[PDB]
Amino acid sequence: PGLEDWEDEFDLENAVLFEVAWEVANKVGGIYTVLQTKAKVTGDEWGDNYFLVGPYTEQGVRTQVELLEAPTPALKRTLDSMNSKGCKVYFGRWLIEGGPLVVLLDVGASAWALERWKGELWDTCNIGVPWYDREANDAVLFGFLTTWFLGEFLAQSEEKPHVVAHFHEWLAGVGLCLCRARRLPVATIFTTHATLLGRYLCAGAVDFYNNLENFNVDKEAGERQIYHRYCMERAAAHCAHVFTTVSQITAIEAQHLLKRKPDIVTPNGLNVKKFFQNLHAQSKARIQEFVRGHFYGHLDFNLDKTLYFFIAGRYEFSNKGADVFLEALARLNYLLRVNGSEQTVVAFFIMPARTNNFNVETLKGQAVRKQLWDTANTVKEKFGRKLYESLLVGSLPDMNKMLDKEDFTMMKRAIFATQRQSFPPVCTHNMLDDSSDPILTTIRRIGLFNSSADRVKVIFHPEFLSSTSPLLPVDYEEFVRGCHLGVFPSYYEPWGYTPAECTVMGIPSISTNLSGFGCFMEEHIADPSAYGIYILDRRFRSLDDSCSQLTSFLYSFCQQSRRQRIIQRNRTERLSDLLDWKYLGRYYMSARHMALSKAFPEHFTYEPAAQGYRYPRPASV
Amino acid sequence: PGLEDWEDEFDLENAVLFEVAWEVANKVGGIYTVLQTKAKVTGDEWGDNYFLVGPYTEQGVRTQVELLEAPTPALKRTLDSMNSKGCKVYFGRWLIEGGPLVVLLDVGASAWALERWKGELWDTCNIGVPWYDREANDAVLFGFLTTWFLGEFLAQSEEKPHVVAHFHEWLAGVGLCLCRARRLPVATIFTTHATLLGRYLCAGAVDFYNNLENFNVDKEAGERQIYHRYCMERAAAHCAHVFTTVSQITAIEAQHLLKRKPDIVTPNGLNVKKFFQNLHAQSKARIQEFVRGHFYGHLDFNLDKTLYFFIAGRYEFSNKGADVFLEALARLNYLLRVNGSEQTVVAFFIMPARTNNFNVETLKGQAVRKQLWDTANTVKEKFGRKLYESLLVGSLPDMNKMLDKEDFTMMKRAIFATQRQSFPPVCTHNMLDDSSDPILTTIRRIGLFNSSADRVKVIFHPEFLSSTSPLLPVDYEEFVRGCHLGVFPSYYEPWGYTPAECTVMGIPSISTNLSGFGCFMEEHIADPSAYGIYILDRRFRSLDDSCSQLTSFLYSFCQQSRRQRIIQRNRTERLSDLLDWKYLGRYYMSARHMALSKAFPEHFTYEPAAQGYRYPRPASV
Amino acid sequence: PGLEDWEDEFDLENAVLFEVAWEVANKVGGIYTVLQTKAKVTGDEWGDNYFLVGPYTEQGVRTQVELLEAPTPALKRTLDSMNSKGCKVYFGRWLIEGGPLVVLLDVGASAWALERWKGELWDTCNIGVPWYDREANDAVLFGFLTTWFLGEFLAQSEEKPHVVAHFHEWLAGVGLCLCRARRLPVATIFTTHATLLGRYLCAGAVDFYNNLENFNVDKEAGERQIYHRYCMERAAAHCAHVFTTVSQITAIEAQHLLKRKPDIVTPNGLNVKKFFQNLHAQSKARIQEFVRGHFYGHLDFNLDKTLYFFIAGRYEFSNKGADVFLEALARLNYLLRVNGSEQTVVAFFIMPARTNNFNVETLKGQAVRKQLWDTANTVKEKFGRKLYESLLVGSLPDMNKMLDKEDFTMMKRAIFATQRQSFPPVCTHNMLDDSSDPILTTIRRIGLFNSSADRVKVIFHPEFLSSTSPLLPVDYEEFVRGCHLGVFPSYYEPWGYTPAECTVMGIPSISTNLSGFGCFMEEHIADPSAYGIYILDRRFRSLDDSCSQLTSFLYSFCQQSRRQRIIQRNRTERLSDLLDWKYLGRYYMSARHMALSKAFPEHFTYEPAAQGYRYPR
């Protein structure tokens, strides 16, 4: 089912959508990609009545925004006015798939108003940003500039349209609060993509989710010198016609930290066109060549029985669950050894870290694999030419005479290059702090040294995968498509971008019910594991018990036949439509309709989601 | 040196060029390609003042001509007039590289005037076409239509421009004669691409060139029922301000048959951009695979010492010198056998003949080569995988164990497919008349049966080379580029299109001083054989002595080292600029200037060629 | 589950398997491929105690058999014996995936015995071959030669092994009957791959399957001058410890024509390794380019909504159900027109027929597509170079200036080549008899002229697909992988080789419950259509009603979303393991065990199939 026909009974009444985010036209997070990929559907629903309001940055305009003249006289008039009133407001087209119009506000250009604005802010919300907080002061400037733009756009518009302003973090929350305080006619959505407290409370506290009700949010933000940022976020959530979260776990966090249950959850959709079995085969061949190089001299395990697990994303050890994955990898190593399995699990940790360079053993192993591959290819081409020559003369090859002295010299050189005594390095790079690295510390603590006995090899690649890289000449998407199972046992993950992209790429993944993507899949798929989606229970299980469940998931994945693994990959391939904005734009549409009805009930009435996007038991299981 | 700067002192005075040929926009010979490829330079020199006058044909307009409206009022007015006066004149753009404008005259549409025109013709030139000659009557219609168009274009043109009409055979010669008879102001060129008598006199008479002075052209044309066509050609040559031939041999023939020495020779140029060592290597590999298939079971000669000679073009046995080439191939076979050379010469005869289908042995040999190639590739990929696996475990391959039972079964099947007792067929096809085929008759008479003792194998391919063909999936140009030596010992060849294209493709070729291309190269290259151009002397040597000289050429080519052959191919690659219209358009320009000066000496004065296009001894020989 | 572990409790007791078929080492049918692909598993179970007894042919030995010396002294002794007794017996290795040993018998070399042998036959089975039947007389020679070889191999073998002789047609049936008549210790399997009567009765009779009980087999064979061949087949089936059929439909035919229910059905397995979505995509791109050429000037339908149905195999119009497929294609054309669908169905008929050459319009359309493709590629490379040049100078392309006069000339030439008034030809070739062709006659009768209004285009390709072909440079397997749905509504099909290979290639197929493959899938898959296997009911429905059901199948396939079609293709991809000899060799193993137990109950006891090979869904 399409997006244009969703809530088609709703008439926007020539309303104008101002989507306000600090990340509009400047990549400072993952919300930039959310806005970029959602712009297509949003502009389809709103045409040119859709404006992304961002902060002006020289890089963003240089690279992403073509500066334009306002299409309508109202926009041009407001832009000229506030440009003459001491602000520096740019208008342009964001050079992305949607081609949306962007109002960019130079917050620095209008810093002169800061003291009169933040004081004004204190006169309306009792929120006073400390001077030393650059981001909070910039948020106040951006919010006051956005509210100025909205007021001067409604004032300088004869038709006086219905304005839906959709703010996306506490950085835009100030403008939201000012829209409500000035009382100008704006239907307001507030989407929080991550509760501000949530990050600190997960990182610091031993347990954060089960203690959500037992948190003094005011006090907790107070000890961390971010009380003003917390108050800005909570006022935006409070001063919003519609409050939205990207996830149901973020919805719980916002309920217990922003003291407002989201009126709707708007999961982060994706442009699935951007992203399976033959492509997976090529990527798996490339991973297999890398593993051949990395384990040169130690290729004593069957590679056709080798499984490629990966955990990727930002190098947040506990938030991304790399600790849980490593514990489960040690337990699965024990399981595969005691069960005497011929299965091998190479688990990749693609988590960027400060690295000096590629480890010498890693680069040497890649060189050794290249040499053996070239030697085998040269000897194979010589053998093929000689064999074709022999068969052309009706002669059966005499294999003893097929290879000459030069072939044996090349092959003996290759074999000499093969010998190694040291085990393959756990990490592919030179860590600036090997002792303090959580992944390497955990690996050396649990006993995963890529030994021959270890059925689980661990390859920590503390750097993003790039095609230009010498070690792995593969970008992240192709490597992932070559893997068997993404493992993202995240503890704190308001939305799982890495597991979501893994799923869109058709790779079975392990997420958690503590992650937004994991909750979204758990509530959209009847039997997620059937579809390649393992939802680890991290809310209601201890870290040790969650490690046990992850080991169970990894072991059951290892114990699948190749036929079962293929069936499961086909199902996860089917799952990609859930994560497309063509479905997840429904929730943004309904949030905007809800806000319009709340702010303008006389003009709009809202009639309350996953219809056509439910995945029951696969018919074939 | 470029063409725009040639005779740049000449000012055309807004003259208009009408190039008249029966082959304008209808491929009925090789002059079609001459006009097509010359149109680019002609339009560069004349812009839109250049018109190709052809006969209208439904196929030509359907495929090649976009019908247009006359760009100038004069053209539109004349077209409308003569379209209202009982003719059917189309105007359009010929969809070729030059994009020239074409005036197409439907000769059938104006056949009503035939009797009053041919009678009128008899009133001006005493030439009366017999009714039964379809081509001669069509030529009279086309000539009268062209002269009508020229008269009505000069009449319906206020400026009264200087019209250069360049007619290209006796088919346009009638219009030329009428232009001169009506005395309308037209500077006329007549190019003859082949004397009409020349064809019959070469085909019938035992010796034609040495008897040129001893020919009664009137009587000779009389016995052949083509006296009117001969008179049309001779009147066109006589009634032309400039008379032109494509070759100096054609110039001699025209002097002794049309009784006029050409005022200039205009060699057939070529669009050399359309067409060397790596491309030659790929084509030679493809020819080698074909020869492996064709000689399956008989591949007892060194293929790295095998030379690929070819003769191509129309299947005219004596005119193309296939008899001389076959005699020289028998003599070269004797030379290579008595000298005990390991050199092999596979001579290809690409001369289309009525063929039922591919010979069974030929298609079977190609299938056998495909099977052996696939078997060798499969066993080679298995060997390469096993060898890479063995070298990855630091193990040297045990060649006895490398190939399995299935590899040996596949290879034994291949070897079984290899066995054959019959020698490889001389012809690749099923000739409808094997007994009457001159090439096959000569091959069986001289003893070239593709036996093992024969150092010269002969492959007659009595059909054009096509990529779509199953036997050879190669077009003519790629096959030729894979060959070592084109052999075109033509007796009658007003221009050598096949040797010229062979040279442009950078292949050393044997032509004759009886061919236009051979004469052109002989007069443009100081040492033609140094440049890969062997000029057989067929004017002043008997057929037997010319066969001896061709055997000497073939043997000296065979006796070149690979280094000498490479040097010679580099030089023939250099020769391509002689055959480009960027040089050979000079002669057409000078012919048009000469005609303008002759017809309008008051307005134009002509100042009398190969400067910058003479090739002395290569600096390196 | 594997084949080595199937009935592993059974011990062969150093038994020797002689698999006797006229098609051993000489391709004279589809049983040749059955034996060739089954040889691997059979030799895995029997090692070198497995012999494929065939008729010697010069071509077969030249191409497929490496002549060898008998590995065992018993084999060498028997070979030398019967080579010295006026017969010519070759021993070798068949150069196939299994590398089995073949005892090839030159029946011509031993024709001297024919008259006495066929006398002996009449003295033992009352079967007398008429002199004029070359195949039946060769069958008698081959059977007597096989029984001679078996008797001399058991006699010239001190251990006296347990010999399992598995004969495969009525051509080997004579040898089977003689094995039983001489009473020599041979455990005999008879597999019939197609009842001899059934082939004649499917066509000649008004309707064959519903009249099986109402057939006088003796009389019916008599009218067709094949009574001796019928009696040979029926005696082989009768004189067999185990009787086997390749299908349950063949089992019914054998019950009602050979008067013996098969003791087991041994479906024709296949070497599935020899044969899905990216490969399908490439093949579908090739088919789409062919359709672009074929329908040049008439490409007014969405090709992303175009479905490629095909029917392939031997050009038996009624047996292969091409009539039913064409009727259903006309009905589906009506359905897609009245429903105003943008779906297009190009149905290919890959059924070889006597063709003079490629039709002029067809070759011209392929040339036009090649020219347009080359023109588009040339203009695209020029545009790409100019666009890269413009972007390298920081300049946005001026699209008006991007294409030059030469580009427009090339494109205008291409467009000129595009125009055509005649509709795309229904057939790609020049039929030697257009009026006599059943497919073309039916197409012109039902109104499928590849018109613009027709939502169903029909391309009859009356020739095998070859890569060497100029028209379609794709072999049969790649073309099929590019198709959406194989349609094999066969009436007579003892085993569906074409639908089976279709399924192994991961392409959904329509078969019938009158086909062996269709019955096999219907009894192995709970919901066959879910797996891309549509079983048309042709036993219990009239030809018109079967046409209606086929139209329903085709229409429901057309009405699947691309998601549903992908799911269905994934399931049919799963189905390939059912058709592998790794599973279907189980039935041959159990038939051989059953025959061993029947002939040697003292030495062997048989303990009775699809376990691990049933598909719930």
Numbering used by the authors:
A (entry chain B), B (entry chain D): 13 to 287, 293 to 625, 630 to 642
C (entry chain A): 13 to 287, 293 to 625, 630 to 638
Quoted passage from the original study:
Glycogen is synthesised through the cooperative action of three enzymes: glycogenin (GN), glycogen synthase (GS) and glycogen branching enzyme (GBE). GS is the rate limiting enzyme in glycogen biosynthesis and as such its activity is tightly regulated. GS is inactivated by covalent phosphorylation at numerous N- and C-terminal sites, and is allosterically activated by glucose-6-phosphate (G6P) binding and/or dephosphorylation. Here, we report the structural and functional analysis of the full-length human GS-GN complex and the cryo-EM structure of phosphorylated human GS.
